[PDB]
């Protein structure tokens, strides 16, 4: 129930991995989705993969 401008995130480089599977880093702003879910945690470097 909101508008999200993902171009703010992808074009800010306060990020390391934009590992998007099923979508391209630049296309999220163009598409509409039913409901989005967010999860968060802190991990180590080599385990990111």
């Amino acid at each position, epitope marked *: 129930n909101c508008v999200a401008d993902y171009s703010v995130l992808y074009n800010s*480089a306060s990020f*390391s991995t934009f590992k998007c599977y099923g979508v391209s880093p630049t296309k999220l702003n163009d598409l509409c989705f039913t409901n989005v879910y967010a999860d968060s945690f802190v991990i180590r470097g080599d385990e990111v993969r």
Partner: nanobody
Amino acid sequence: QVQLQESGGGLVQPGGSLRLSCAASGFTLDYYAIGWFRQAPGKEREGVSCISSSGGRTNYADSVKGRFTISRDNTKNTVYLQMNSLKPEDTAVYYCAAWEASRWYCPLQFSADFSSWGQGTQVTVSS
């Protein structure tokens, strides 16, 4: 499969020269802006120099201003850091990293987060 490899380091005499080659496999390095980084033993990671994805914008550090030169070969998927008039202060392991534009404006003199960190090569200057 996104790999960055640092090739071209070694032990050099002060006042000499050396060339570094950053190799990318599994992805297109042309779409990524590259910036070299150094972390000497006992020193924090300070920015060497940054070059944009198109190569038309270049960043440099005042500690190596006029001595370190950056060029990229997007056709060969490689970015080169040419070093001249070396000093013992440059004895550090060197990493090349890829990341996108962090803000408006073309130059990338402002540091930001870096995605792909390579294995790194240690370049030693001592004589």
